[PDB]
Amino acid sequence: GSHSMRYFYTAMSRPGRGEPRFITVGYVDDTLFVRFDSDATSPRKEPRAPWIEQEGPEYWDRETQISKTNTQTYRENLRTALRYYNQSEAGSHIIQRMYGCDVGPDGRLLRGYDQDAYDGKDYIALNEDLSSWTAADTAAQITQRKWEAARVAEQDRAYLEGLCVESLRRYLENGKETLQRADPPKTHVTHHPISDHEVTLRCWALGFYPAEITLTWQRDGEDQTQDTELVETRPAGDRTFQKWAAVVVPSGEEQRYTCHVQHEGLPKPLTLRWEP
């Protein structure tokens, strides 16, 4: 159906321990496909998915040059951020960026993104119009004025409507065996006595791709939001994801509870119960 491409930058200053580290990771959907680390023995963009390997040497050189230039730019950005927030040169700070595009089933642009953060807080973002900015504070407003003067949004827009969608379409074709394959969850309910009169029911989803999933418990057909323990979706390390949802229920009432599972790999949502 729909798909996304995102690049994520982390630039971390480290006074006393060299120049700030710069890391880039690139994803299509929930699949890592490229990385760059300025601390690498010989820093280059490196493939992390089989389908990007067929890109030619020109690709790798160009992509590597972008990352080396950005290492310098984001180092400059860290210095500028110090000035804008009146901060000392003694502390460690982080700038993050996430940017990319979403496309529909027809491959047309659904929306573009380009956002930055400073020390984990929103700093500046390209608006959905790809024409204007939202600045988080008076420091970011300085950046906004510079970017407005230099027509940076127009540059973003031309990328997000052109190269971003074009390259993503090609990756989706080259990787169709995996990027266009949903693996549904394998599901089961376990039952663990807590004590004479309480039991934990745990609803498991395993082996699914992509990561997006919904797991809910009902009691007598009523969602149990407040009483459900839900773990964060976690990577299995084989491309797939895992998740579970758990409720504590009175002994002898197990059958009043049903686990409901939604995932794009399922033709219909699943309903599961403890199977004694």
């Binding site: 880039t24 690139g26 992509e63 984001y74 230099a150 940076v152 971003c164």
Partner: peptide, 9 residues
Amino acid sequence: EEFGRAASF
């Protein structure tokens, strides 16, 4: 493919 232009803060 990345965007090759990165404006300074």
